[PDB]
Each structure stands twice: as C-alpha cells, then as structure tokens.
Amino acid sequence: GREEDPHEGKIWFHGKISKQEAYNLLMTVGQVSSFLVRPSDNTPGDYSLYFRTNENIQRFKISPTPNNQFMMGGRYYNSIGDIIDHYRKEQIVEGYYLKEPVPMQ
16 A cells, blocks of 8 residues: 655645645645645655745755654754754744644645
8 A cells, every 4th residue: 555654644744735735825724934844846755844934935945864864954853843843943034933834624
C-alpha cells in the first residue's frame, strides 16, 4: 500500500493540495499571519512553509536530513513542529510571527 507522509495528521500539514489551492486556503480560511506546510513541488523530499503577510504569501524552504532533522533559515531543527514553535515566539519576517494554522479542510 501507499505510505502517507510522516506529517499527515498534523494540524498545519496539507499533503494533497496544489500551490494555488494553498494560497486560496490562506486567503479564505486563513487570516494574516496564518500558515501551512506542504511538500515541495520542485524539490522532492523538501517541504514549504507558507505564511500570509498583509500584502502577500511567502514560502520558506524546509529541507530534511538523512537523520530526520529539518533545515530552515540556515538552522537545523529536530522537527517541523519545532520550527513552528520557534517562529511563534521569534519573528519570521520583520513585524510578523506565525499565529494560526490553516487546518486540513
């Protein structure tokens, strides 16, 4: 059978939407400072953190390691959940923190 992504069931993880569908969710379900994570289209094995500012949606690359850690913003983290915890408490863009996930609908 087909294996699901290890992050399936995380509130912020969307395994089967397109990039534009993620944007649409952030603009309709989400509010400013909402976020979600999906697998990268262009780099197999990577993830993308999508984040809504007042003017646009920004994407941040998350690159896993062979030992199942995750590189983001030049720094390694034990999990994607730890990246999210970090940027709820320290700004991800000037003036902005992560606030609410967009849940899988």
